[PDB]
């Protein structure tokens, strides 16, 4: 089997992408944020405390003939940005772009933090990191990809994110018309439960490529590109009005500037981020300062190849027993 779904940015800055997912019988469609940086599939529901629900579509398990409560299992998760949610667990049928999985755990939120209540566009998250990061207890639950593998034509999934435009998530096949050149594969370390890999170096604009190992994770659920402080400083040093602002939280530059490109190495190949993708957007509407797309990972602890980097390439999450990550220009 295979699946194909359109993913669309939730706003004009590409803050995050949502993809519709059908849960239960008959199907209830919810727009979830596909996150390669965690392993929990959780949604807003009829169990979510009322005052924390605000504009999202919820999943009601009592209206699904295929839902089953998973006795005694509970979950609790917190994210990099400080948000969190917790609740109980049901198993149900979930389908994405035509690919159906029976018995998938769908974690039902009893409570959600403020930032989730505040964003009307995201109905929950669908985790696609390794199952060892799953928060359910006492027994962890498999992600939608892991439950899907047995039926997939091939055990992979690809992410083709667009810049200010929809894109696609594919399950079980590699669409050869969506990229140019050939895909270059790099090893993944699953020690930390992420799709963790090491870039062989970087280049800023038309300058030299420096070979230096940069270990990071490929995370479709992080908006920005977070790299080591000395590489982020070498990039901004090439933009005349950029400065690090403590008040805004990062490097800012005049919206007026033409930013240089950023290239990252994958093995012997190079993936080039055009400069316009690096210009995240004005600090406030009408402002003349814009927030930069590449920022320091020093305070986070790990480098993160987020959406700014992933939307410049076609990326293959090869889920074979020894997983690998593939990148191609597009």
């Amino acid at each position: 089997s295979t699946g194909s779904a359109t993913t669309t940015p939730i706003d004009s800055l590409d803050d995050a992408y949502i993809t519709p997912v059908q849960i239960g019988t008959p199907a209830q469609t919810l727009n979830l944020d596909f996150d390669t940086g965690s392993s929990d599939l959780w949604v807003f529901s009829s169990e979510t405390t009322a005052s924390e629900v605000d504009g999202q579509t919820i999943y009601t398990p009592s209206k699904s003939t295929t839902a089953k409560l998973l006795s005694g299992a509970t979950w609790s998760i917190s994210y990099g940005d400080g948000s969190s949610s917790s609740g109980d667990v049901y198993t149900d049928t979930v389908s994405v772009g035509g690919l159906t999985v029976t018995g998938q755990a769908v974690e039902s939120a009893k409570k959600v933090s403020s930032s989730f209540t505040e964003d009307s566009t995201i109905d929950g998250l669908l985790g696609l990191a390794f199952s060892t990061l799953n928060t359910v207890s006492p027994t962890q639950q498999k992600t939608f990809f892991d439950n899907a593998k047995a039926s997939l034509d091939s055990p992979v999934f690809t992410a083709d994110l667009g810049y200010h435009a929809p894109g696609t998530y594919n399950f079980g096949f590699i669409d050869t018309t969506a990229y140019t050149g050939s895909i270059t594969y790099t090893a993944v370390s699953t020690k930390q439960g992420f799709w963790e890999w090491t870039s062989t170096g970087y280049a800023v604009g038309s300058g030299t490529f420096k070979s230096t190992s940069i270990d990071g994770i490929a995370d479709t659920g992080t908006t920005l590109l977070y790299l080591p402080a000395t590489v982020v400083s070498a990039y901004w040093a090439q933009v005349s009005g950029a400065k690090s602002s403590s008040s805004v939280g990062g490097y800012v530059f005049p919206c007026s500037a033409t930013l240089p490109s950023f290239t990252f190495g994958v093995g012997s190949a190079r993936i080039v981020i055009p400069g316009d993708y690096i210009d995240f957007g004005p600090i406030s509407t009408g402002s003349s300062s814009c927030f930069g797309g590449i920022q320091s990972s020093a305070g986070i602890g790990i480098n993160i190849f987020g959406d700014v980097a992933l939307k410049a390439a076609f990326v293959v999450f090869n889920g074979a027993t020894t997983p690998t990550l593939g990148f191609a220009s597009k």
């Binding site: 803050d15 940086g37 392993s39 917190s78 994210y79 990099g80 479709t220 987020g306």
Partner: peptide, 8 residues
């Protein structure tokens, strides 16, 4: 307004 999906 950025997001950064697991981790303490």
């Amino acid at each position: 307004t950025f997001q950064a999906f697991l981790r303490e």
